[PDB]
Structures are given as structure tokens and as C-alpha cells.
Design a protein around this ligand. Sequence first.
Ligand SMILES: CCCCCCCCCCCCCC(=O)O
Ligand SMILES: [Cl-]
Length: 292
Amino acid sequence: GMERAAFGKLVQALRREHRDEKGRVWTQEVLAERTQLPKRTIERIENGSLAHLDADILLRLADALELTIGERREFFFAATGIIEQKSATYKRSPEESLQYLIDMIRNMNVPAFVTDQYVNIIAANMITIRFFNIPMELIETAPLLPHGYNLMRVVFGTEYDFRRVVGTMWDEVARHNMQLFRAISLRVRADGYFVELLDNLMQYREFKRFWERAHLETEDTSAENFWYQYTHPVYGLLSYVSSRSQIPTSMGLLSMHTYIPLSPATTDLFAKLSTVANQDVIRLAPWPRSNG
Ligand SMILES: CCCCCCCCCCCCCC(=O)O
Ligand SMILES: [Cl-]
């Protein structure tokens, strides 16, 4: 769950991601109109001065804001989730939590990487780098861009041609990654850094295209594994499943992404890539991003 003021700032950020029929940013009046609610109610929700948020209001807001199935789930929980009297306790500190995920992906002989609350890539083992054949210059120049290490920059960016790698599977893979991005980021949409991140991602024509279409999907894949099956332009026929595990920290969530091989040729490819040089993890986006 969330405090009323934080939830209010979330509604404001979600509203401001929209443009009406005349291309204007949605005002409180427009959100009021689309939800058939009084402007004062939208005003009180956004200021966090409304103690109780009933189901009709929340459903009207989720419907008007055209949230994805994954976003609806996160949005409703941010509004109705019971906050405990005692603050959450964690076995490991944020630093020990990331180090624990790094120590684990270092020991895997399959591609594995870590993302945070903005879906920025925090760390990756060298098997991931070798598998995706990421130019080392693109890693070197990622600190110079606000969206430089974002998973959406890899999938939808112009510098690395991910569409070429997955080929005919592009629509499916881009749809799934858009669903993941939108459901994971839902809780941090009012963050100044997220607003900046979204504006940079919106400069990519293909990101915008999949973003505006995302709510039309009737099937949710954001909380599920994706089974990749395609002819890779250089590795040939591959078959593998990507899994995402989440861990909570006092500085926001951490996600671990792993790719399990599902064919002898994919098994052999991952085994060859784990052999090359040795087991190592490359540090990418700094974490926590704003450590305080
Ligand atoms: C350019 C900065 C990031 C450098 C390395 C990132 C490695 C992560 C690869 C991400 C591709 C995953 C997308 C997918 O499987 O659908
Ligand atoms: Cl390649």
C-alpha cells in the first residue's frame, strides 16, 4: 500500500501522461469528466485529503486512466493495501541484497541480470553480454543518457537493434516487455527521475507505438515467464524461457532475470558462452539510484 499523499501524487502523474482529443495534457477537470466524479473529489485524491477511497472511485480512475491489467493490480493495491503499524523489516540491507543477487548471477551458467524499480539494468553476468552481443562502446556511453541503462532502451532503442535479433517474434517480445515495464514502474510513476526517463523513452517511435497500444491487451504476461522460440540470425534455432524474481529492499525492489535453456542447441550455446574467459558480473546503472 501507499500513504494518501503519495497515492495522490501517483494519480497526478498518471493523469499527466495523457493527452486528450485536442492533444492537451489532461487536467483535473478532464479526469473528473472521464470518471463522472466531481473536480473537488479529483482535487482531494491528488492532495491526499480523502481518507477513504471506495471501489467505485478506484475502478472509475483505473478505467479512465486506461491502465494495463498489470497496472490495475498495482494501482488498486497502492490504494487499498493495509500499511502495518511497524515499518517493514529485511534480513539484508539494500547493499547486501544487491550483492546477494550479484553473487548468485556470477555463479549461473545461463544469461542473468538485475533490474530495479525503474527497470534500469543494475548488473549482468558476462554470459548476458556475450549472448546479446552488446557493443562495449554502447555500455561505455550509457552513463551519458538518463535512459542509458534502461531495459526499454535495449528493447526499443535505435543504438542496439533488438528487433533484428528476435525478428518475426518482435511484436510479441515488445508487447511483453512493455507490459513488464508498465506494471513494474506503476508505483514510482510520480518520481521525478521516472518522468525524465519516460520523456526520453517517448522519443523512440517504436516505444510510443507499443506504449499507446498496451491497454488494448486482454491477456496479461507481466507476472509470467516468457517462452522464446525463434531462429536467431546468428545462433540459429533457440528455445528458452525468461523468468523474473523480485526481492524487496528498504530502497525499492530488485528483480532478477534468468534465461533457462529448453533445447539441446540452446543448452550447448549457453554452456559455450559460460566457458569463454570466465564467470564475472558487469556493474551497470548505479544502485540505489538516489541513495537517500
Ligand atoms: C546498454 C546498457 C545495458 C548493457 C547490457 C544489458 C544486458 C541486458 C540485456 C537485456 C535484453 C532483455 C530483453 C528480453 O529478453 O526480452
Ligand atoms: Cl547478435
